[PDB]
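request received
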Amino acid sequence: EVHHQKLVFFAEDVGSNKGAIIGLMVGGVVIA
Amino acid sequence: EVHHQKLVFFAEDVGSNKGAIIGLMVGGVVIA
Amino acid sequence: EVHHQKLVFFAEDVGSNKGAIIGLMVGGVVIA
Amino acid sequence: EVHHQKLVFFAEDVGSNKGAIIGLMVGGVVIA
Amino acid sequence: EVHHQKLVFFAEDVGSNKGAIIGLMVGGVVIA
Amino acid sequence: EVHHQKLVFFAEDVGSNKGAIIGLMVGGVVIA
Amino acid sequence: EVHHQKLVFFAEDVGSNKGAIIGLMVGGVVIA
Amino acid sequence: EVHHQKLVFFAEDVGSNKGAIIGLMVGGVVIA
Amino acid sequence: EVHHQKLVFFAEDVGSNKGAIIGLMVGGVVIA
Amino acid sequence: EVHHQKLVFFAEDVGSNKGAIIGLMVGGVVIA
Amino acid sequence: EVHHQKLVFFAEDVGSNKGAIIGLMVGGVVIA
Amino acid sequence: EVHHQKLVFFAEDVGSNKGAIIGLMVGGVVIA
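response:
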């Protein structure tokens, strides 16, 4: 059992994003 | 069993995005 | 069992988007 | 089971969009 | 049982991001 | 049984980010 | 039962960041 | 029962960061 | 019952950091 | 019942840091 | 019932810091 | 009821620090 209240992902005023993630994450990610 | 309240993804004023995600995330991802 | 209340995807004023998602996210993705 | 109340997809002012989605997201995908 | 209140990811005013993540993180992640 | 209040990730005004992460981490992470 | 209040990761006004992390950290982690 | 209050990682006004970490750490961590 | 109040890592105003860490550390850590 | 107040690592105003650590430190650690 | 107050590492204003540590240390720590 | 007060390491205003340690140090390591 999981209870969550209030979630805010990556915030304002950005030049460039490479790879911004929220989750459980099972397996993998490659960033170049 | 999972409960969520007030969920907000990636915020305002952005030049360029490469790869921005919300979820469980199962498997493999590549960003170049 | 998953419950969501007040769900908000990617916000205003974007120059260019490549790959932005809300979901369960299963399998794989390539971004270039 | 997945349940939603007050669901909102991506916001105003975009120069170019490539891959912006709300759903389950299942499979293999490429973005170039 | 797990209970969480007020989650906030990476904050405002950013020139460039490479790799900013929140999660359980099972497996491998590579940032070049 | 776990209870958590106020989670705040990496703070404002950054020239460039490379590898900024929060999570359990099982396996490995590489920043090059 | 475990109770936690006020988690704050790496603070504001930074020229460049390389490798800033919070977690349990099981296995191998490299910053180069 | 266990109780924790006010966790604060590395503080403000910094020219450059390389390798700044908080965690249990089981295995190996490398900074070069 | 165990209670812990105020945890504060490495403090403000610094020209450059290389290798600043807090944890349990089981196995080892290398700083070069 | 056991209570602790104020855990504080290396203090403010420093030209450059190389290798500054706090922990239980089980096995071995190397600083150059 | 036991009450502990103030655990504080090396104090403010240092031109450069190298290899400065607090801990239990089981096995041991190499410094150069 | 039992009480303890003020664990402190080295004081303020220093030209350069090298190899300053406080700990139980069970086992053995090289310091230079």
